[PDB]
Amino acid sequence: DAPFDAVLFDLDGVLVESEGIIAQVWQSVLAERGLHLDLTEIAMYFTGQRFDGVLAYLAQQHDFVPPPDFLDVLETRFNAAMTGVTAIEGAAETLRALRAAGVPFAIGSNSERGRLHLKLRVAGLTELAGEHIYDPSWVGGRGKPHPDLYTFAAQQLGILPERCVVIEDSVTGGAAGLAAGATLWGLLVPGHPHPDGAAALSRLGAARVLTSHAELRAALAEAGLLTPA
Numbered sequence: 469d470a471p472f473d474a475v476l477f478d479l480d481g482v483l484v485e486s487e488g489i490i491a492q493v494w495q496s497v498l499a500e501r502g503l504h505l506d507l508t509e510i511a512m513y514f515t516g517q518r519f520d521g522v523l524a525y526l527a528q529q530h531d532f533v534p535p536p537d538f539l540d541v542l543e544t545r546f547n548a549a550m551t552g553v554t555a556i557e558g559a560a561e562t563l564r565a566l567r568a569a570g571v572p573f574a575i576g577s578n579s580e581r582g583r584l585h586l587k588l589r590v591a592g593l594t595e596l597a598g599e600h601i602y603d604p605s606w607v608g609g610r611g612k613p614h615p616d617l618y619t620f621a622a623q624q625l626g627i628l629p630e631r632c633v634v635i636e637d638s639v640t641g642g643a644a645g646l647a648a649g650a651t652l653w654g655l656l657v658p659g660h661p662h663p664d665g666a667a668a669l670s671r672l673g674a675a676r677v678l679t680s681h682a683e684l685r686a687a688l689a690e691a692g693l694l695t696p697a
């Protein structure tokens with residue numbers, strides 16, 4: 469009984485750390501303008517939100533309306549900041565282990581193509597991540613939670629999606645993996661923000677919810693993909 473042929477990876481929160489970096493930018497730019505919010509609130513409510521929706525949040529929850537230069541200063545600083553994206557601990561080790569064992573894998577991300585590649589570059593993961601790196605431009609813009617990216621990535625590997633395991637840290641991405649017919653394993657490495665938590669991923673239908681790359685590697689071995697410690 470060997471359930472999987474291949475692994476499909478999310479990028480943000482799973483292979484690279486960028487949402488923590490984004491949260492810190494929000495935090496410092498607001499702080500400079502009077503408002504001091506904690507990193508957990510900013511990650512929870514600012515990330516992946518449209519600028520006008522962040523403004524609405526600030527006005528409703530914090531009675532706060534930012535100065536005229538808010539939009540210009542955040543863009544400067546979100547720019548300067550993408551260069552500091554870093555590899556999730558143990559991510560390179562997982563990619564290295566899968567390459568050594570000849571297990572096919574792909575990356576699916578909603579990031580614009582150049583930003584996807586920039587993040588793998590700055591995180592030192594380009595060579596490990598390989599050829600199968602897919603953003604929504606490959607599927608006509610139909611990104612997660614649509615299953616399209618993962619269906620396509622499986623197809624590019626020549627593996628049936630039902631025989632893939634998807635490694636994700638959000639409902640948006642986990643949903644895309646389940647809707648493609650894959651098995652979902654949530655990965656929530658602590659000390660980095662994720663858009664959703666363990667209970668939401670399990671209720672969504674994650675078969676398990678892992679908390680480190682070391683844990684992931686053990687699970688992949690139980691599943692017959694890697695060699696057990």
Ligand SMILES: [Cl-]
Nearest residue numbers: 555558559560
């Ligand atoms: Cl790493």
Ligand SMILES: [Cl-]
Nearest residue numbers: 577578579641
């Ligand atoms: Cl994504």
Ligand SMILES: [Cl-]
Nearest residue numbers: 479480577578
């Ligand atoms: Cl991503």
Ligand SMILES: [Mg+2]
Nearest residue numbers: 478480481637
């Ligand atoms: Mg993610």
